[PDB]
Amino acid sequence: NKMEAKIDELINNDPVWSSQNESLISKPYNHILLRLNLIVQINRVMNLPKDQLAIVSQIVELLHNSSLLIDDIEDNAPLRRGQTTSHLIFGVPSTINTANYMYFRAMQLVSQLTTKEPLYHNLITIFNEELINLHRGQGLDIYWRDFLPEIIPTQEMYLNMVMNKTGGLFRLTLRLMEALSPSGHSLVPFINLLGIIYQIRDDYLNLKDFQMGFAEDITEGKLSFPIVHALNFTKTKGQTEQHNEILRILLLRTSDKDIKLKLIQILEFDTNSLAYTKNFINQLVNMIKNDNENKYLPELLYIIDHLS
Amino acid sequence: KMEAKIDELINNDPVWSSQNESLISKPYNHILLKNFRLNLIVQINRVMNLPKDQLAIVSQIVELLHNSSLLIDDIEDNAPLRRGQTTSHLIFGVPSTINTANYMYFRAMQLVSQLTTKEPLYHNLITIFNEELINLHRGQGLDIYWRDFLPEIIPTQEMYLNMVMNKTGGLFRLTLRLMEALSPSHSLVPFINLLGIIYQIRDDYLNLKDFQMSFAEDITEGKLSFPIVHALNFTKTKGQTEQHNEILRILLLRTSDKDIKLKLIQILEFDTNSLAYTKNFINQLVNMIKNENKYLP
Ligand SMILES: CN(CCCCc1ccccc1)CCC(O)(P(=O)(O)O)P(=O)(O)O
Ligand SMILES: CN(CCCCc1ccccc1)CCC(O)(P(=O)(O)O)P(=O)(O)O
Ligand SMILES: [Mg+2]
């Protein structure tokens, strides 16, 4: 009877949750807490009041960090910015849960951007759309890597994957801002380009810093821009043994330095994928540095050079 | 030319094909392999009277969340089996399974926007969805924390019940709250909360019972199960130090050894009588429902 009473009190009330509980489950996220400038540069064109901008920034910070927590689990990464990955400290289970929890806390923050219902609807849809896009590209990248050689993506396929996986957070941020603006043409194209440059450079530097960075993308088996070029080049030029050796090294998930270095030199001297990628980056970067009529642009370059 | 193809890319929406859609959907399609879930929604609709059309979408949203949460739950519990079939993450890998499951959360979210076009109502439906996914994760988070930090914290029965209100109460309340918000006709939330609690305790109980008369994967997982919480607090209170530690030691083993699993169940059967205490607890919760329609409609 005292039990029924306690049960009645329980089910007629919201779930009990303490600040203590909140702290216990935020451990994986607080650890990774250990680009505001980008939001700021973009606002020079968007003109949102500082308090609304602070919230946009918080939503993006939460999505970005939660994405990395998941990303490192999916990539089996032992390090993130020189420090141990959260999943290795607190475990995969709590890290997945906490990262997913933060996606929804970010969602909750959108309502703090406006009281006006029409705008609200648009903001949520934007948030919903780019999160869908992010998971689509992430899914492809992961599928290509874990089922290799089932699918050898072409350069076109890679770029489409990146438009989703990486362009997703860039467009989310930008689109939220454009929708909130109380103030020319949309900068989505420019942000899409920024995202592509960001990803190819990220892929590039992962190997170049090693050759000149632990080339962890090799250990991971990732279909990076240089690898995608090498695999299509070898197939095309009939370099049968080199093509297969590239596949073989990716499939070893090796941390051996010499093996990673052998692969990088294949990309350097045999397929010339490194120079190809470097030039590719330069081309995309000149496309912005060169549109004097501001076909893409509205201190935007400083950013482009620190994109890393 | 290269400039041109890039120009064509960045000015279009990201490319995504039907074939891409299928690849990402594999881990999910695998768990689809629902009749009692549909039945619960149907039965409740006799009071909400949503127009079939709209009932189907709620049903679709619930199916997505329920299934994606199980894909994630099996990874978090390192479960090898789900309803007798091999778990998704063991076939498609942890990486694709996490991603596909999370993708389905956002697909479910998209379906919410298609329940209504009325602006006020839409906002409430989103807030409902948002709030219960928050609760689900909090609850799941605490359940996982207790298990993975054991023996730092041993919960009491009350802590366990509050955890369940979140972990299991969320999907139940999410379905009910949406339906009540959509109804064109007292809340049934308190009733759905009890359904969820009865649901979780019976799930914990059967996991040990089915095996006692035979996987008891909960032991292998080291779960702070309802019978386990009772046995741990019982031995502490009765000052039975060595029995208390023995339960702790078996759970910490993460053991698949049948004999050791059986040893823990006999502690629960003969020392703390925890399985019988649980049977009784569930029967009392149910009696609350069968015995003036305060909870019932
Ligand atoms: C999809 N994510 C966005 C990363 C962050 C992109 C970004 C967005 C907004 C602001 C700054 C950076 C990419 C993460 C990686 O690039 P990937 O796993 O694809 O190689 P990395 O593991 O190398 O860090
Ligand atoms: C969260 N899950 C489902 C909760 C109830 C799911 C449900 C089913 C149908 C309709 C609504 C909700 C609780 C049960 C578990 O997942 P399972 O024992 O199946 O591994 P766990 O105890 O491990 O957390
Ligand atoms: Mg990564």
CA distance B47 to chain A (A): 20
**CA A262 to CA A223: how far, in whole Å?**
17
Of the candidates B99, B161, B170, the beta carbon closest to that of A138 is on: B99
Instruction: Show the tokens assigned to B206.
Output: 């059967």
B120 touches chain A (CB under 8 A): yes
B113 touches chain A (CB under 8 A): yes
Q: Measured between alpha carbons, how far is residue A136 from residues A48, A63, A142, B62, B86 in Å?
A: 30, 16, 10, 21, 25
Tell me the CA–centroid distance for residue A162 and ligand 1, in Å: 10
Contacts of B46 (CB under 8 A, 6+ apart): none
* Long-range contact pairs involving A155-160 (C-beta distance under 8 Å, separation at least 24): A155/A225, A155/A228, A155/A229, A155/A232, A157/A228, A158/A223, A158/A225, A158/A228, A159/A196, A159/B6, A159/B9, A160/B9, A160/B14, A160/B15, A160/B16
Q: Which ligand is nearest to the CA of B223?
A: 2
B209 touches chain A (CB under 8 A): no
**CATH hierarchy code of domain B1-297:** 1.10.600.10
**CA A55 to CA A111: how far, in whole Å?**
10
Largest CA distance in chain A: 81
Tell me the CA–centroid distance for residue B125 and ligand 2, in Å: 23
Are B271 and B235 contacting, i.e. CB atoms less than 8 angstroms apart? Answer: yes
Contacts of A200 (CB under 8 A, 6+ apart): A162, A225, A277, A280, A281, A284
Q: Which ligand is nearest to the CA of B73?
A: 2
Interface probe, candidates A8, A30, A142, chain B, greatest B C-beta count within 10 A: A142
Q: Measured between alpha carbons, how far is residue A116 from residues A110, A120, A224, A249, B176 in Å?
A: 12, 6, 43, 55, 27
Find chain A residues with C-beta within 8 A of B197's C-beta. 7, 10-11
Instruction: Show the tokens assigned to B76.
Output: 């978090």
Are B140 and A19 contacting, i.e. CB atoms less than 8 angstroms apart? Answer: no
Tell me the CA–centroid distance for residue A143 and ligand 2, in Å: 28
**CA B182 to CA B101: how far, in whole Å?**
27
**CA B254 to CA A290: how far, in whole Å?**
61
SS3 A118: helix
Give the position, in ligand 1's atom list, of the atom nearest the Cα of A77: 22
Residue A212 carries which DSSP code?
-
Task: List ligand 1's pocket residues with C-beta within 6 A.
Answer: A 35, 64, 67, 71, 75, 165-166, 169-170, 202
Instruction: Show the tokens assigned to A272.
Output: 């010339």
**CA B111 to CA B49: how far, in whole Å?**
19
Phi-psi region of B16 (alpha: psi -120 to 50; beta: other; left: phi over 0): beta
In single-letter form, the type of residue at position A7 comes to I
Residue that the structure tokens 């879930």 belong to: B37
Give me the torsion for CA of B147, A10, A107, B124, rounded to 10°.
160
Q: What number of CA atoms fall less than 13 Å from residue B222's CA on the CB side?
A: 21
**CA B86 to CA B56: how far, in whole Å?**
29
**CA A163 to CA A196: how far, in whole Å?**
7
Q: Which residue of B has its CA nearest to A103?
A: B134
Domain ranges of chain A: 1-308
User: Is A192 flagged in the annotation as binding?
Assistant: no
Beta strands, E only, chain A: 79-80, 83-84
Q: What number of CA atoms fall less than 13 Å from residue B88's CA on the CB side?
A: 28
Residue A175 carries which DSSP code?
H
Q: Measured between alpha carbons, how far is residue B127 from residues B10, B177, B237 in Å?
A: 33, 10, 43
**CA A226 to CA B167: how far, in whole Å?**
44
Instruction: Show the tokens assigned to A211.
Output: 């050759």
Length, in residues, of chain A: 308
SS3 A83: strand
Mutate which of A62, A64, A209 to test ligand 1's pocket (most atoms within 8 Å of Cβ)?
Answer: A64
SS3 A20: helix
How many angstroms separate the first and last alpha carbons of chain B? 68
Binding site per annotation, positions of B for dimethylallyl diphosphate: 82, 167-168, 200, 207, 223
Contact A146 B14 (CB under 8 A): no
**CA B102 to CA A128: how far, in whole Å?**
12
Are B22 and B163 contacting, i.e. CB atoms less than 8 angstroms apart? Answer: no
**CA A188 to CA B177: how far, in whole Å?**
37
Give me the torsion for CA of A210, A213, A214, A218, rounded to 10°.
-70
In single-letter form, the type of residue at position B196 comes to G
**CA B160 to CA B179: how far, in whole Å?**
28
**CA B24 to CA A137: how far, in whole Å?**
10
User: Is A14 flagged in the annotation as binding?
Assistant: no
Closest CA to A241 of A218, A276, A270, A275: A270
CATH superfamily of A1-308: Farnesyl Diphosphate Synthase (1.10.600.10)
In single-letter form, the type of residue at position A100 comes to N
DSSP characters for chain B?
-HHHHHHHHHTSPPP--HHHHHHHHHHHHHHH--HHHHHHHHHHHHHH---HHHHHHHHHHHHHHHHHHHHHHHHHTT-SEETTEE-HHHHHHHHHHHHHHHHHHHHHHHHHTTS---HHHHHHHHHHHHHHHHHHHHHHHHHHHHHHHTTS----HHHHHHHHHHHTHHHHHHHHHHHHHH-----SHHHHHHHHHHHHHHHHHHHHHHHHT---HHHHHT---HHHHHHHHHHHHTT-HHHHHHHHHHHHHT---HHHHHHHHHHHHHTS-HHHHHHHHHHHHHHHHH---SS--
B166 touches chain A (CB under 8 A): yes
Are A241 and A228 contacting, i.e. CB atoms less than 8 angstroms apart? Answer: no
Phi-psi region of B78 (alpha: psi -120 to 50; beta: other; left: phi over 0): left
Find chain A residues with C-beta within 8 A of B11's C-beta. 189, 192
Tell me the CA–centroid distance for residue B70 and ligand 2, in Å: 7
Contact B134 A100 (CB under 8 A): no
Write the burial class of residue A152 (CB in 10 Å: 0-12 exposed, 13-18 middle, 19+ buried).
middle
Q: Which ligand is nearest to the CA of A81?
A: 1
Contact B98 A140 (CB under 8 A): no
The structure was resolved experimentally with X-ray
DSSP characters for A272-301?
-HHHHHHHHHHHHHHHHHT-TT-SS---HH
Is the minimum distance from the CB of B39 to ligand 2 under 6 angstroms? no
**CA A297 to CA A184: how far, in whole Å?**
10
Phi-psi region of A127 (alpha: psi -120 to 50; beta: other; left: phi over 0): alpha
In single-letter form, the type of residue at position B140 comes to Q
Q: Measured between alpha carbons, how far is residue A143 from residues A75, A204, B96 in Å?
A: 12, 21, 7
Tell me the CA–centroid distance for residue A202 and ligand 1, in Å: 8
Asked whether the bond before A226 is cis by omega within 30 degrees of 0, the reply is no
Contact A167 B127 (CB under 8 A): no
Are B103 and A139 contacting, i.e. CB atoms less than 8 angstroms apart? Answer: yes
Find chain B residues with C-beta within 8 A of A4's C-beta. 284, 288
Contact B138 A21 (CB under 8 A): yes
Indicate if the alpha-carbon torsion angle B161, B163, B168, B169 is positive or negative: positive
Instruction: Show the tokens assigned to B247.
Output: 């339960």
**CA A243 to CA A113: how far, in whole Å?**
51
Find chain A residues with C-beta within 8 A of B96's C-beta. 139, 142-143, 146
Instruction: Show the tokens assigned to A120.
Output: 């609200």
SS3 A16: coil
Size of interface A-B (CB pairs under 8 A): 192
